[PDB]
């Protein structure tokens, strides 16, 4: 299996190039386009790494390419838990799809936030706001795919199933990878807690058997401080959870939030994923 990791929200986490150079990750998820909708100019935030609006992130394209030359997929994530977004109409979804196509993917723009590199796809991390028109958005982005240049689509729903914000989008059948967040939902009977692997194992079965995507990933916090709840000590993960979930036909690997908190976690579990 593969490890996917979020990057971009903590300037202390190392450069994107360094993250890829570790050799531990097959996907790096750049985060986030934090605000969007109602035809307004989106805001891109990468903490202290660089300032997209200032034009100082254009140097990131050499880092994106360094990742890609190592067969690592680099995705741009929309949303996140701290942002402010919603789509107001199908036309609004078309507007935002065009923005993403032209500014991050194989389209063209004179103000690409991260430079001339072509991101491998878009990660839907829709955690708040209204639930409407994300199916519209997914379909619009997928239609920009070419046989020469694939637009990957990935999604990060919360573990309660179905996910309120992403179910309609996921039901389009257009998503390649889904990394479910088995964290921050402590009362929902779907994530790990001390002495309880029953809920997460049951939720994993529900997700794998009810989703159209071809690859499903177990999304976890990389350290106790990376989330409010749900962190799994690595020996519990590798001893009690990975061997069972890896029997699923659609097991893709593990997703981690986030690079800042992953000083030892992926290193410890690498050969069991
Ligand atoms: Cl505006
Ligand atoms: Cl909850
Ligand atoms: Mg800067
Ligand atoms: Mg359903
Ligand atoms: Mg939440
Ligand atoms: Mg028991
Ligand atoms: Mg299964």
From Swiss-Prot:
Keyword Plastid included in the entry's annotation: yes
Species annotation: Punica granatum (Pomegranate)
Domain GH18: 1-273
Functional pH dependence: Optimum pH is between 2.5 and 5.0. Removal of Ca(2+) from the protein by EDTA treatment narrows the pH range to 2.5-3.5.
Tissue occurrence: Highly expressed in seeds and to a lesser extent in the skin of the pomegranate fruit (at protein level). Not expressed in leaves or flesh of the fruit (at protein level).
Lineage: Eukaryota, Viridiplantae, Streptophyta, Embryophyta, Tracheophyta
Annotated Gene Ontology cellular component terms: amyloplast; extracellular region
Example of a GO biological process term: chitin catabolic process
The protein's name in its UniProt record: Acidic endochitinase Pun g 14, amyloplastic
UniProt KW keywords: Allergen, Amyloplast, Calcium, Carbohydrate metabolism, Chitin degradation, Disulfide bond, Glycosidase, Hydrolase, Metal-binding, Plastid, Polysaccharide degradation, Transit peptide
Enzyme class at the top of the EC tree: hydrolase
Disulfide cysteine pairs (residue numbers): 20-67, 50-57, 159-190
Catalytic residues (UniProt): 127
Any Pfam family the entry gives: Glyco_hydro_18
């Amino acid at each position: 299996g593969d490890i996917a990791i979020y990057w971009g929200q903590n300037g202390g986490e190392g450069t994107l190039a360094s993250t890829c150079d570790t050799g531990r990750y097959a996907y790096v998820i750049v985060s986030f386009v934090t605000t969007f909708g109602n035809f307004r100019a989106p805001v891109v935030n990468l903490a202290g790494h660089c300032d997209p609006a200032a034009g100082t992130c254009t140097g990131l394209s050499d880092e994106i390419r360094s990742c890609q030359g190592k067969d690592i997929k680099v995705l741009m994530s929309i949303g996140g838990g701290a942002g402010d977004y919603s789509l107001v109409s199908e036309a609004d979804a078309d507007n935002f799809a065009d923005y993403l196509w032209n500014n991050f993917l194989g389209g063209q723009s004179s103000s690409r936030p991260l430079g001339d590199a072509v991101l491998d796809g878009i990660d839907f991390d829709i955690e708040l706001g209204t639930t409407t028109f994300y199916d519209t958005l997914a379909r619009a982005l997928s239609s920009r795919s070419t046989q020469a240049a694939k637009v990957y689509l990935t999604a990060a729903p919360q573990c309660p199933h179905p996910d309120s914000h992403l179910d309609a989008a996921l039901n389009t059948g257009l998503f390649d990878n889904v990394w479910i967040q088995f964290y921050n939902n402590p009362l929902a009977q779907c994530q790990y807690s001390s002495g309880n692997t029953n809920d997460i194992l049951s939720s994993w079965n529900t997700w794998t058997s009810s989703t159209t995507a071809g690859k499903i990933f177990l999304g976890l916090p990389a350290a106790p401080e990376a989330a409010g709840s749900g962190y799994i000590p690595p020996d519990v993960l590798t001893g009690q959870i990975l061997p069972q979930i890896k029997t699923s036909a659609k097991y893709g690997g593990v997703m981690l939030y986030s690079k800042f908190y992953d000083t030892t976690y992926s290193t410890t579990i690498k050969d069991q994923v």
